[PDB]
Paper text:
Hence, we set out to determine the crystal structures of cathepsin complexes with representative peptides of cleaved substrates. Reactive site mutants C25A and C25S of cathepsin V were used in structural studies.
The pattern IV group (binding of cleaved peptide fragments at primed and non-primed side) included structures of two peptides, LLKAVAEKQ and RLSAKP, which were both bound along the active site cleft of cathepsin V. LLKAVAEKQ was designed as a hybrid containing the LLK-fragment from the LLKVAL peptide, which was cleaved and remained bound to cathepsin V on the non-primed side, and AVAEKQ, which bound non-cleaved to the primed side. As expected, the fragment LLK bound to the non-primed subsites S3–S1, whereas the fragment AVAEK bound to the primed subsites S1′–S5′, as resolved by the averaged kick omit map. Despite the continuous electron density at the cleavage site, the distance of 2.4 Å between the C atom of Lys at P1 and the N atom of Ala at P1′ was too wide to support a covalent bond between the fragments. The distance of 2.6 Å between C of Ser at P1 and N of Ala at P1′ and the continuous electron density between them resembled the LLKAVAEKQ structure. In both structures, the MPD molecules competed with peptide binding at subsites S2 and S1′–S3′ and CL– ions at the S1 site. Peptides from patterns I and IV bound to cathepsin V consistent with the observed protein cleavage sites, whereas the peptides from patterns II and III did not bind according to their cleavage site found in proteins.
Author numbering:
A (entry chain PAC): 449 to 453
B (entry chain AA): 1 to 221
Write the structure that this text describes.
Amino acid sequence: AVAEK
Amino acid sequence: LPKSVDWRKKGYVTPVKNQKQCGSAWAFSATGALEGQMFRKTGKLVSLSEQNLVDCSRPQGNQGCNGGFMARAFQYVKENGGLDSEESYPYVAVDEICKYRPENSVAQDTGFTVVAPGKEKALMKAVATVGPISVAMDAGHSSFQFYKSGIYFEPDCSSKNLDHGVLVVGYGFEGANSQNSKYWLVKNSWGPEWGSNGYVKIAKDKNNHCGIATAASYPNV
Ligand SMILES: [Cl-]
Ligand SMILES: [Cl-]
């Protein structure tokens, strides 16, 4: 899953 | 087995990375596990190339920024003969041309070992005896996106339908009693700003919470 920063 | 384990304290783990807007967590989980094993074998910690996995492992079943599996990445490294360093094959978070160069390889594997599915005690044995372990989990929750402290527990978590690859670097417990308030130490790939410096404590021996022992594996070096 993605969500980065 | 030990009451607690933390491979970060022994030099096995690289700083936290950031996958950005690319579905490549499976590649970061696999490089994390290979980085541990190469350190156990040689004494040298070298950051490995997720981009090499993203661009080159389509034949094995991976889909780049659209998803993949850690076992398929270890299969690629075995069939390929090698894996490049992050320095030589940098991360750009998009699908690109395979640029694998044997002269820049800093890692190899002969296959991989699977942890028995569903078994948190089998996962505990592998973490204690081997090093960091690749694992799948259900991370699709706002509570996980905004995690900051504490032992993570989410009722909505599934132990069977998973969507994210991470790295188990250890396990521990709160308190003086080693037999309760247990947790898995997990390295994510959403940057050091996410979570607790890029890490999360996931509830341990609470019925395979979020699927951490459902599909666990490690490379054989
Ligand atoms: Cl896998
Ligand atoms: Cl920390």
